Amino acid sequence: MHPAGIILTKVGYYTIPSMDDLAKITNEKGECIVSDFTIGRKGYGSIYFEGDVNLTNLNLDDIVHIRRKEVVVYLDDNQKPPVGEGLNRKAEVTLDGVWPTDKTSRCLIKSPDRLADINYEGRLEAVSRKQGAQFKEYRPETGSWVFKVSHF
Q: How many CA atoms lie within 13 A of 13 on its CB side?
A: 19
CA distance 29 to 8: 20
The CATH architecture one would assign to domain 1-152 is: 2-Layer Sandwich (3.30)
CA distance 47 to 100: 22
Query: Is 45 buried (19+), middle (13-18) or exposed (0-12) by CB count in 10 A?
Result: buried
Residues 7 and 28 sit within 8 Å (Cβ to Cβ): no
Which residues neighbour 34 within 8 Å (Cβ) at sequence distance 6 or greater?
17, 22, 25, 52, 53, 55
Domain boundaries, the chain: 1-152
Residues 60 and 13 sit within 8 Å (Cβ to Cβ): yes
